[PDB]
């Protein structure tokens, strides 16, 4: 039924579907829009994950044999013109420069974009730079987006006295006999007060090989991260409603930009995937936190990832996000952030990358490779921060290959670009951040000042 809401589009418009209905609205849409266009006409869909778009390529050439189905999760393939269907990853067409990728682009009827609320950088990327060519493209943006008790199970307060301590959240001791899972943000917390389960006298395991020993006796009472990837007979869930994920501070002073792992709240589908662990058995419960789980996955950080791939081509990848997000609506915005993250993004294109720097964050394994780009128009020589553990200042370092870097000792740095754990050094060292040295840094400087006032 909605192929001929697809087929109606000319080169230059775009339309988001909604629906989401069996298992495959990307492979059952695109199908059908298919057995309508003809077999001699390439369809692109994009997809997250490189084994997603693998899985749903096996069973769609298994399925169907008349229709041609194609797989790019690999190497570019030069002048491709496969006629079937293909499923492609976004990061798969993110190696292509800017000529390649609109080559590439209009070489298609339809390019389906699947699961674009995820918002990996590879993602925001693509969106954003076939939006550049918008033009000369027909985009179609889809998406996803027994009985269960709710209760907001409230926070303990410090030294109080049909309850048990599980990290601030006040559960029933009645409800240790049954079976729950624990879902909290910290890495360190699912061995602490995993740990403590045990300690206290219920039978507990953490996040393989050790979950299929844990799993088979009873009672059992698990906490655990972010990991869908179900469970043997699961009782009831208990939720902090957080998790442990990324964020970046911009400010006017330098460091400009500051990132790191922090605690926040997980989303309404992120949410969903806790709400939905247990239930289909049997009627179950859960427990979430006094916070609200967010309608978006705030995407800032993965942002400013996702700016890395405009370097090569000369692409601001925040103006180009900007602007599809202003025609497609695809996304929810924090106006001011956006703003200051594109003066940054114009700092970090305003001249050509040394070949030296741009050899060094493709054979590095730094998590984020960026802050080398970013860094590299006040600093020459990379700098080795005192890796922070349990909030204080260790004599540990990062051992990055490639980096070729200077050990901090006291010689402070002017960096456009730092961590929570550096920027924290340099508070606990009792040490300061020097003025930026380049007039370029201080452009974005006075540029950020101004656009945080209004």
Same mark, same amino acid.
């Given at each position: ?11 230059? =418009?775009?339309?988001?579907? *909604?629906?989401?209905?069996?298992? #495959? ?91 674009? /609320? ?12 076939? /939006? ?9 943006? $889809?998406?996803?987006? /027994? ?9 303990? $307060? !410090? #030294?109080? =006295? ?7 959240? !006040?559960?029933?001791? =009645?409800?240790? &006999?049954?079976? $729950? ?9 699912? @061995? ?10 219920? %039978? ?34 208990? =939720? ?7 964020? @970046? ?14 605690? $926040?709240?997980? *989303? ?56 599809? %997000? ?31 720097? !741009? ?23 990379? @700098? ?22 200077? &050990?901090? #000792? ?8 730092? *961590? ?16 930026? #040295?380049?007039?370029? @840094? ?13």
């Amino acid at each position: 039924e909605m192929v001929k809401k697809i087929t109606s589009m000319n080169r230059g =418009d775009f339309k988001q579907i *909604t629906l989401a209905t069996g298992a #495959g609205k990307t492979t059952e849409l695109p199908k059908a829009v298919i057995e309508e266009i003809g077999r001699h006409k390439r369809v692109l869909v994009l997809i997250p994950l490189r084994a997603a778009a693998e899985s749903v390529y096996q069973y769609m050439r298994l399925k169907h044999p008349s229709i041609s189905f194609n797989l790019r999760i690999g190497d570019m393939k030069e002048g491709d013109m496969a006629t079937g269907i293909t499923y492609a990853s976004y990061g798969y067409f993110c190696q292509m420069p800017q000529p390649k990728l609109r080559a590439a682009m209009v070489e298609y009827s339809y390019i389906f974009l699947d699961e674009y /609320h995820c918002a990996t950088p590879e993602q925001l990327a693509i969106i954003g730079k076939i /939006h550049r060519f918008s033009e000369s493209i027909r985009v179609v943006a $889809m998406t996803a987006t /027994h009985p269960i008790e709710e209760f907001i199970a409230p926070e303990v $307060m !410090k #030294g109080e =006295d049909q309850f048990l301590d599980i990290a601030g959240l !006040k559960i029933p001791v =009645d409800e240790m &006999k049954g079976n $729950m899972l624990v879902f909290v943000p910290t890495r360190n917390m699912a @061995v602490e007060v995993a740990k403590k389960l045990k300690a206290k006298g219920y %039978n507990s395991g953490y996040y393989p090989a050790n979950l299929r020993v844990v799993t088979s006796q009873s009672p059992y009472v698990i906490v655990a991260t972010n990991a869908i990837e179900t469970l043997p007979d699961l009782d009831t869930v208990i =939720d902090t409603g957080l998790k442990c994920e990324k964020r @970046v501070r911009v400010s006017s002073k330098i460091p400009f930009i500051v990132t790191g792992l922090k605690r $926040m709240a997980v *989303t309404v589908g992120e949410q969903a995937q806790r709400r939905g662990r247990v239930g289909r058995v049997k009627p179950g419960r859960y427990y979430r936190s006094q916070e609200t789980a967010t309608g978006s996955k705030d995407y800032h950080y993965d942002l400013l990832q996702a700016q890395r791939y405009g370097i090569e081509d000369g692409i601001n990848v925040t103006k180009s996000f900007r602007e599809m %997000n202003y025609d497609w609506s695809l996304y929810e915005e924090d106006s001011l952030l956006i703003t200051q993250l594109e003066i940054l993004n114009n700092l970090l294109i305003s001249e050509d990358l040394p070949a030296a720097v !741009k050899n060094i964050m493709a054979r590095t394994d730094h998590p984020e490779p960026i802050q080398l780009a970013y860094n590299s128009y006040e600093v020459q020589v990379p @700098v080795l921060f005192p890796k922070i553990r349990n909030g204080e200042v260790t004599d540990t370092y990062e051992n990055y290959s490639f980096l070729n870097a200077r &050990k901090l #000792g006291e010689d402070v740095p002017v960096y456009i670009y730092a *961590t929570e754990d550096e920027d924290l050094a340099v508070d606990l060292l009792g040490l300061d951040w020097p003025d930026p #040295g380049n007039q370029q @840094v201080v452009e974005t400087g006075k540029a950020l000042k101004q656009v945080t006032g209004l």
